[PDB]
Amino acid sequence: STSQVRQNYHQDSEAAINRQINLELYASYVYLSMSYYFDRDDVALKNFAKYFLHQSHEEREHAEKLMKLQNQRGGRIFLQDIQKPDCDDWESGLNAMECALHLEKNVNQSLLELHKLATDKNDPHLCDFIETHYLNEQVKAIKELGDHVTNLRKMGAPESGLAEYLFDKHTLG
């Protein structure tokens, strides 16, 4: 039953990786929803749409890298349903950015818990994997989203539709 390659890879770590895969696919789905919200004719913020579509594809890449890791370590991928996102209508550029920030922090928290588990199970390869490929990416993503939210609020989003328009053009464009 044991993979010929498996070494120093705890069942709890394997399970946590499967959970993280699902979470990354979920985040991808959330970003896809946001992107196409901004593609609506009654919202029409092309660069918001592009930004979130880019994030969606990036999250899918993160999930696939975790799947690759799972196979590298001799664990077995078990996929679960990808839940639909919490909203169909994201209301505004600012609200979408805040929800993205919240999502990224939730993903980061899950990654930190995964690192804690890896550390507890004395799995330095897994710890280094998380550090190298995920934790700094998360910190940068959170910082960028925070910068965006700060700018939007100072510009007067979301009540100033001019604010979101010019943000779309000058930051995201």
d(CA 73, CA 5): 6
Q: Which of residues 61-80 bind Na ion (CB under 5 A)?
A: 62
Binding its own copies (rule: CB under 8 A), the pick from 85, 90, 94, 117 is: 85
Q: Which of 12, 15, 54, 76 binds its own copies (CB under 8 A)?
A: 76
Q: Which is nearer to Na ion, 14 or 59 (CB)?
A: 59
> 59 a known binding residue?
yes
Q: Are 24 and 107 in contact (CB under 8 A)?
A: yes
Cβ distance to its own copies smaller for residue 4 or 11:
4
DSSP state of 86: S
Binding mask 45-64 for its own copies (x = CB under 8 A): -x------x------x---x
Q: Which positions from 19 through 58 interact with Na ion, judged by CB under 5 A?
A: none
Instruction: Name the token pair of 107.
Output: 């993903």
Please, which residue, 39 or 137, has the CB nearer to Na ion? Answer: 137
Look at residue 62 and give the partner it binds from its own copies, Mg ion, Na ion, none, a contact being a CB closer than 5 to 8 Å depending on partner kind: Na ion
SS (H, E, C) 144-160: HHHHHHHHHHHHCCCCC
Name the residue nearer to Mg ion (CB basis): 62 or 115: 115
Among 61, 86, 89, 128, contact with Mg ion (rule: CB under 5 A): 128
Q: Determine if residue 109 is left, alpha or beta; phi over 0 gives left, psi from -120 to 50 gives alpha, anything else beta.
A: alpha
Query: Rounded to an integer, what distance in angstroms lies between the CA atom of residue 9 and that of residue 72?
Result: 11
Counted residue by residue, the chain has a size of 173
Whole-number Å distance between alpha carbons of 138 and 96: 18
**Positions at the binding site for Fe cation:** 24, 59, 62, 104, 138
Binding site for Mg ion (CB under 5 A): 128, 131
